[PDB]
Structure formats: C-alpha cells, structure tokens
A paper describes a structure:
Growth of the iron-oxo cluster on the inner surface of FtMt therefore occludes the putative transient binding site Fe4, preventing the binding of incoming Fe2+ substrate here. Control data collected on crystals of HuHF grown under identical conditions and treated equivalently demonstrated that the formation of an iron-oxo cluster is unique to FtMt and not an artifact of the cocrystallization method, Figure S6. Most animal ferritins are heteropolymers composed of H-chain subunits, which contain the FoC, and L-chain subunits that are isostructural but lack this catalytic site. Ferritins such as HuLF that lack a FoC exhibit much lower mineralization activity than the H-chain and H-chain-like proteins.
Ferritins play a crucial role in iron homeostasis and detoxification in organisms from all kingdoms of life. They are composed of 24 α-helical subunits arranged around an interior cavity where an iron-containing mineral core can be reversibly stored. The ferroxidase center (FoC), an intrasubunit di-iron site, catalyzes the oxidation of two Fe2+ ions coupled to the two-electron reduction of either molecular oxygen or peroxide. Mitochondrial ferritins are atypical of those found in higher eukaryotes in that they are homopolymers in which all subunits contain both a ferroxidase center and a presumed but undefined core nucleation site.
Author numbering:
A (entry chain A), B (entry chain A), C (entry chain A), D (entry chain A), E (entry chain A), F (entry chain A): 5 to 176
Write the structure that this text describes.
C-alpha cells in the first residue's frame, strides 16, 4: 500500500484508469479526423489543424489523470487504445457530429466518475473532476454544437462551398 | 422643491422618467437578442457581440438621462422594465428588423420629448436631447437599415449561408 | 431538444431563469441607489460611484447565467425586471443596510439553486455556482456588513458628517 | 448574532476553530524541524530552509481560516498551540517521515471538516475547503512521500552522505 | 556538549528558550488582535493590518533567538504557546493599551535576560540583546504610547468616529 | 485512385501504416515509463520528464508518417495501439534497457521499410526515411546505450543512490 494513499477508494482508482484509456481514445479519434482532412481529396487545412489541436488536448487530459493517480497513491494500469470507429469521416459536418457524440460520451463517463467519487465521499476527487474536466467538457460540447449548427445552416454537407468557407472563417 | 431647479417643467421631469424606462427597455431587448444568437442552434457569435454592445449602449443612454434628471433638480421615478416582446427572434434578419423598429420607436419618443421641451421653452433640455440622443438615433437607424438591406440582398433569412457570411464580414 | 443538453434537469433550467431575473433586479436596485446619492440634496459622490459599480457587476452576474443556460442547452426565458422597493433610500447607512439585505436574499436564492443542482446530481452546475457566485456573495455580504458597522459607529445616520467622511475615506 | 451570518452552522464554526489550532500546530512542528537542521551537529541548511518555508505556509493556512471565520460571521476562539511531539528529530529521513504523518493527520481533519460541511449543506464552506486546502494537502503529501522514498533509496538514515546530497540536489 | 559552545552559561541557554516562547506568545496575541479588527462588527481594516504586521515581526524575533541558540551551541526546547488572555479586545484603544502592556512585559523579560548575561560575563549575548531587541522594544513602546495618546485625545473609545479616523490617518 | 499518387507501391503504403502504429506504440511505452518514475515509491522526476519528452517525440514521428502517407496519395489505416509490455519498470536502469530494446526494434522496422522502398525503386520514400528517421534512431540508440552504461558503472540498479544522482546530473 502506498504511503501517500488516503481516502482513495479502490473503485475510484479503477475508474480513473478507465478514464485515462478513454481520454487516450479521444486523442486517437481526433488524430484520425485531423489527417482525414489532410487528404488530397478532402483538403480542408483548418479542419485538420483544429482536430490535431483537439487531439493534443485529449493527451493532456490523459496525462493529468495519470498524474492524479500517482498523486493519490493509486497505480496506473494501461489498456490497448482502440482504433477509432471510422476510417472515412465523409465530410466536415459529419466529423463535427462525430466529435460532438464523442465529447458527450466522454462527458457521461466523467459524470459517472463524479457520482462514484461522491458515493465514496472523496471531495478531493470530486473537485479535481469539476475543476479540470467538467466545464472543459461543457465548453467543448457547446463549441462543437455551434460548429455543427453553422455547417448545417450553411448547406453542408452537400455544399462543398460551405465547408470550404467555414474552414476559412470559423476555423481559420 | 430642489434648490437647483430652474425653468424645468413638471411635465418635462415626468417625460424624462418615461424616457429612462424606455432606454432600459431597449437595453433589455438587445440583451435578449444577444443571447438568442449565442444559442447552440443559432450560433452567430458576432450577431451576439453586436447586440450585447448595443445593450450596453442603451444602459448608458438611460444613465445619462438619470444624470440629467438630477442635474435639473427633478426626481427619478423608476418603473418595471418590461420583458421584450419576443423570446425567439427567428433569424439574424428578423432581429435586425426588430431592432430597426425598436430604434424608430425610441426615436419617436425622443422627438415627442423634444416637442414638449420646445413647448415649455426649455432650451437646455432641447440641446441635451439634440446633442446626446437625436443624431445617435439617426445613425443607429441608418446602420440597422443598412444591415437589413444587406441581409435581404444576400438572401436572408432563407440562406443560412448569407447570415453566416454577414456575421463574419460586417459584424466581425 | 438541444444537441448539447446533457444531465441538465428541466427544474434546473427554470431555476437558472429565475436567478437571471433576480440578478437583473439587483442590478436595478443598485442603479436606483446610485443616482439617489447623485441628487443635489444628498450629494455623496462616492456612494453614487460605489453603487453604480455594484449595478454593473450584477448585470455581469446575469449575463454569465445567460451564457450558462445556453452552454447547457437550456432556453432563456426573461421576465419583467421589477422596480426597486424604495424610491427614497434616506441615508448612506440605510442604503447600505438595504444592499446587505438584498445580497443576503440573492445568496439564499443561490443556495436554493445549489440544493436543487445537488438533488439533481448536476456537478457541473454545482461547481459553476460555487466558482462564480457563492464566494462572491460571501465577500459582498461581508463588505456591506463592514460598511454598515463603520457608518453606525461613526454616528450615522444622524451625523451627516459621518456619512460625508465615510464617503471620502472608505468609498473614495 | 452576526449580521453577515447565513447558512453557517454552529458546528461548522467550532470545527473551523479546531482547524485553525491544528494549522498553527503544524506551523510550530515545522518551525521546530527547521531549527533542528540548523544545529551545528546536524547542519543541513536546505532541510532547515525547506521546513521553515513549510512553517510559514502553515501560518498562512491558519490566517486564511481566521479570515473565513469572520467572512461567514463566526467568532474566532483560540486555544494553546501545543509544542511538537519531538524535540530531537534524529535525521533528515525521520523528519520527512514525521512531516508526512503530520500532513496526513491534517488532511484527515480537513476531510472530516468537509464531511460536516456536506452534512450541514454548506456549499460555500465545501468549496472553500476544496479550493484552498484539499489539493494543497494532496500535493504536500505526495511531495513528502517522494522525499521519503528518495532518502530511503539513497541509503538514509545510515548514510550521512545521502542526506547531505539530498539536501543539495533536491532541497537546494 | 556542543563543539561550538564557548562562554555560554546553562542559565543563559534556558533563559533564551523562555524568551523564544514569550516572543511566540506575543506573535499569537497580535494575531488574535488582528482578526478581532477584521470582524464584521468591528471592521477597522488598518488596525487589522497593523497588528498582523506586528504578529509577523514577533515571529521573526522568535526565529532570530532560535538562530542564536544554535549559534552558541545551546539546544532549543519549545513549550506550548499559550492562547492570548482576551478573546474580545473591545475597542481600538483597548487593543493598543493591551499591546503597550504586552511590549512592556516583553521588555522586562529582555532586561532580566540582559542582567543574567551581564552576571555571567557573556558580552556576545549582551550585544545580541542590545543590538536586535532593546531599541526595537523602546521604539515599539513609544509608538504604542503615541497611538494610545492620540486615540484618547480623539475621544476613544466612546467615539467610534475617532477610531475610524485614526484607522485611516495614522494606520492607513 | 488518388490524383497525386505516383511511383508509390501498395506494399509501401501498407508498410507506412504499420510504421505509424509502431511509432504510436513507442509513444505509449514512453508515456507509461514516464509516469512510473512519477510514482511516490520511485520518485525520479527527471527520468519522468525525459521519458515524457521521448513520448511526445514518438507522436511527432507518427504524425510525420501520417503526413507522408497523404503526401504520396496513400490512405491511412489505423490499428489499435497495444498497451506496453510492462506495467512495472522496476528501476531507472531497467527502463533505459527497455527503451534501448524498443528503439532497436523500431530501427529494425525502419530498415525493413527502407529495404522495401529500395526494392520498389521509390527514391523519395528512401530519402524520407533516411532524412527524418534513420539518423534520429542512431542518435537515440547511442544516447540510451550511453545512459545504460553510466547507470551500470554507477552501481545501478542496486544503488538507489546511483539512480538518484544520474537523475540529477545527466537527466537534470
Ligand atoms: Cl499544450
Ligand atoms: Cl462604454
Ligand atoms: Cl467589468
Ligand atoms: Cl508567502
Ligand atoms: Cl519581514
Ligand atoms: Cl515538439
Ligand atoms: Fe487548447
Ligand atoms: Fe478529454
Ligand atoms: Fe462517428
Ligand atoms: Fe452513443
Ligand atoms: Fe474532449
Ligand atoms: Fe459603442
Ligand atoms: Fe437609446
Ligand atoms: Fe420585434
Ligand atoms: Fe410599431
Ligand atoms: Fe438605441
Ligand atoms: Fe468590480
Ligand atoms: Fe449577483
Ligand atoms: Fe430596503
Ligand atoms: Fe427579507
Ligand atoms: Fe450582489
Ligand atoms: Fe510556498
Ligand atoms: Fe496546512
Ligand atoms: Fe513524528
Ligand atoms: Fe497517527
Ligand atoms: Fe501542511
Ligand atoms: Fe516591520
Ligand atoms: Fe518581540
Ligand atoms: Fe490586555
Ligand atoms: Fe502586568
Ligand atoms: Fe514586540
Ligand atoms: Fe526533442
Ligand atoms: Fe520513433
Ligand atoms: Fe522491456
Ligand atoms: Fe526483441
Ligand atoms: Fe524512438
Ligand atoms: Mg478544445
Ligand atoms: Mg492496488
Ligand atoms: Mg478491433
Ligand atoms: Mg461539491
Ligand atoms: Mg472552473
Ligand atoms: Mg450602437
Ligand atoms: Mg416633484
Ligand atoms: Mg407582461
Ligand atoms: Mg451633435
Ligand atoms: Mg461588488
Ligand atoms: Mg425546454
Ligand atoms: Mg409593481
Ligand atoms: Mg469546486
Ligand atoms: Mg473560488
Ligand atoms: Mg509546501
Ligand atoms: Mg456564537
Ligand atoms: Mg504538554
Ligand atoms: Mg483547485
Ligand atoms: Mg513593529
Ligand atoms: Mg544541555
Ligand atoms: Mg489555559
Ligand atoms: Mg555593554
Ligand atoms: Mg542599535
Ligand atoms: Mg529523443
Ligand atoms: Mg488503396
Ligand atoms: Mg493484450
Ligand atoms: Mg539522402
Ligand atoms: Mg540527415
């Protein structure tokens, strides 16, 4: 047992390891999305940059959870990082819709994590999740919803012109 | 009676209190408009910023009238600030059309106020209204008419692309 | 239903709309207070500035709640902003006592909002209220209590000298 | 009763006074530790500096709780600050082990305080404890565990060379 | 026996440990005083700042004596730091009168310490006390007497106005 | 078929996708290593920083291969990123030995990739591998061998002192 461990339930430790994997998975999804828009037959450079930045942010999310695990005296256990569900993301709109669904799924996992931390009376872990994850998620979900809405109203995915102009004006 | 009061008719005092309420009402209309465009299913960020700035300007209008009331020795009497007529503003074009109608209504109130000040031979109040309100109104009405015209010619409200591009190029 | 909405109870949405109205009401109370001290027969310029700044802060409070409503996928619904209970605030001490009572009332509303968010297991909303409102309120209540105490010990409201000197040394 | 007091349970007030005493006690323990390493027969200058800084941080912890007590309208009640359990701390490793045990004890007190604030539905006090104390404690406990581990692996306490080199490279 | 010890009497060593405790006690008295003036029903912010600074100075006094003990090869022995005699300090004037009495008591202890160092022919300890403590005490006693005098002549403690104005002009 | 594709064999395209996975795997190994040294019972902060930087470099390696795939008109196909072979890396020396073995394995894959590009007469791909990977690998392998050698000669893994001092002087 770790000399630093205090009020840190084994179930919370396990849940944190599951969350680490999920954040790394989200990083992988956004990495895949990014280079889809770098294809010569897609060629939306600011979509590509946007998703690559999101990919890097998700890796930071994972790293901060790994730091937390050690801070509390838990032990990191890593799993395979599953490949993303799509190889082909079809359109800027469809990728944004997938990212929205991804972020809502990660949010649900974080909310279940917070419920567990609450049930185990772990206020430090509750505050950690609230402080570093829950509002980040709300902002990410809101931004992706905003993007989806604009692309739809602009005429995407049918209008390749719309995706092009969104790439320049919103993501550029 | 106030030691500063001079040539300030009771009717003018009352009219100034009515104008204070109207300016606060205009501030509220623009506040509502602003956050309509912040909705995830509308998502026109520069419409939102534009109307929020207009909201703040209207509050300044109200404050300067409250200052005038005290400068002249009248007594401020506040009324409820009525909620705006619309919860849903439908489109960027429709919001601009509503703001145009609002500004023309506030202008009419200011012109009636000026007629009263003229009838009561209050040149200080006439100059105050002319100096700080009447040309501000003309410029605001002209700008909103310009915006309405551009949105119409661009294809709004049917073209969500038009509202998007107007948001970036004129309001951005 | 909003594409961004997740774990956001209809009751919380309604409570947030009620809180928006209350913050706008507080802004109106402080606006009224401010210009009372700008009257030529009151003439406490730093009381006036202090309350005007508080008025502007309350509008910011309202705006941040409107932003939150949209972030979470709720829909803003505005109500009339009621006029303040007093036209005449009588003295610097009495205005500070009224502001203290106002802030304690707004605090109670925020604490009921937090209880609801807790009952609905909304940790994001709990953190939002804690982060942006609850300590702001505690600090505001403490500052107003401090001011009330000083004015009382100085001899207010009987001593117009006390209110004058407090205006210069504490609010100036 | 205090004019500022709102939703602040008498039990919480008492618990905050107990925590104030404990933080002052921790300040005293670290003060004692510091000057032990300033002895001519111990002479580890960076151990001494490290613990003196920790001592000053604990006094700041106490002061912020005294500020909180007044912010919420409770009344500070001070008790004797007990002398530390050890006059002689024996070795750099043993002092770090004692500081680790101290911080875990203070953490437990803070977690009991948070449970009480939760039971009394005091979200402001919960947020205060989370924001200013609980992660500070986790970081302090982790750092002391790190230090203990390094000193042990280096060969302390038997190796006076290890304590000397740790003083220069980690604490210097 | 310490390798550095020279001409340092066991009685002086013990007296220095007693003085360390007394300086820490004075630090505690001023800490208590400080937060009394931070109460919402007292609310003299510059009294609070003044006494908090005095508290920090007393801790520095204690630390320099702990340094001296080690410099001379004595061994620090700590005792409980007794809580201050008053929880309620009643008025700015009464707190200043108590601080004056405190400083005169600490001065008497220092003068007895100096007599002992003289009797034991310890010129280094005599010079240390003279250099770092005796004139600091005289200046502190003179300043507190000055403050008491001004508060009395101003009309304190009856005049809450006097304490308020002293807070701004002398302590501000 | 891609409009940009020229002299790019399907076998090379597949090999590049295999290399992408391997570089992401190496990133994961170094991520795991990094946080092993962040454990409170290991606590070698510069080992942790060193491996985290290596992790980030490997992700850059992967990204540049994804860019190459698109530049040449191939299509990225991602696979699961396998978890690292070790959860526990035991010692600084053992982690360096594992990283050395990892880099030699990645080098072998790159050399097989280069042989394939040579056999398919793809000089652009040969130059890409030589320019951006092969000397990076040689330098990485040499540096890790240097580190292993120093740790062994210093007395690792038995000497926890050696690993501590290596952490400060070579990795610090
Ligand atoms: Cl970054
Ligand atoms: Cl402005
Ligand atoms: Cl502001
Ligand atoms: Cl500090
Ligand atoms: Cl200092
Ligand atoms: Cl880089
Ligand atoms: Fe970022
Ligand atoms: Fe994430
Ligand atoms: Fe998808
Ligand atoms: Fe789903
Ligand atoms: Fe995310
Ligand atoms: Fe403007
Ligand atoms: Fe206006
Ligand atoms: Fe309208
Ligand atoms: Fe009309
Ligand atoms: Fe207007
Ligand atoms: Fe402010
Ligand atoms: Fe507010
Ligand atoms: Fe009132
Ligand atoms: Fe009431
Ligand atoms: Fe407020
Ligand atoms: Fe610090
Ligand atoms: Fe502490
Ligand atoms: Fe101990
Ligand atoms: Fe214990
Ligand atoms: Fe501590
Ligand atoms: Fe000083
Ligand atoms: Fe002293
Ligand atoms: Fe006393
Ligand atoms: Fe006495
Ligand atoms: Fe003193
Ligand atoms: Fe590098
Ligand atoms: Fe590589
Ligand atoms: Fe290995
Ligand atoms: Fe092998
Ligand atoms: Fe490598
Ligand atoms: Mg992002
Ligand atoms: Mg375990
Ligand atoms: Mg699979
Ligand atoms: Mg909570
Ligand atoms: Mg936050
Ligand atoms: Mg304008
Ligand atoms: Mg009248
Ligand atoms: Mg109505
Ligand atoms: Mg003009
Ligand atoms: Mg304020
Ligand atoms: Mg609804
Ligand atoms: Mg009414
Ligand atoms: Mg929180
Ligand atoms: Mg906060
Ligand atoms: Mg510290
Ligand atoms: Mg009580
Ligand atoms: Mg005892
Ligand atoms: Mg925090
Ligand atoms: Mg002093
Ligand atoms: Mg002895
Ligand atoms: Mg006692
Ligand atoms: Mg002499
Ligand atoms: Mg001198
Ligand atoms: Mg490298
Ligand atoms: Mg193919
Ligand atoms: Mg496996
Ligand atoms: Mg070449
Ligand atoms: Mg080269």
């Amino acid at each position: 047992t770790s000399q630093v461990r205090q009020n840190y339930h084994q179930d919370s430790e396990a849940a944190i390891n599951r969350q680490i994997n999920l954040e790394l998975y989200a990083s992988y999804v956004y990495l895949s999305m990014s280079y889809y828009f770098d294809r010569d037959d897609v060629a939306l450079k600011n979509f590509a940059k946007y998703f690559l930045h999101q990919s890097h942010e998700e890796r930071e999310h994972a790293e901060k959870l790994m730091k937390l695990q050690n801070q509390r005296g838990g032990r990191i256990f890593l799993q395979d990082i599953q490949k993303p569900d799509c190889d082909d993301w079809e359109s800027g709109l469809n990728a944004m819709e997938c990212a929205l669904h991804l972020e809502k799924n990660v949010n649900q996992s974080l909310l279940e994590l917070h419920k567990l931390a609450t049930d185990k009376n772990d206020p430090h872990l509750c505050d950690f999740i609230e402080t570093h994850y829950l509002n980040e998620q709300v902002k990410a979900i809101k931004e992706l919803g905003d993007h989806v809405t604009n692309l739809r109203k602009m005429g995407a995915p049918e209008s390749g012109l719309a995706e092009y102009l969104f790439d320049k004006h919103t993501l550029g």
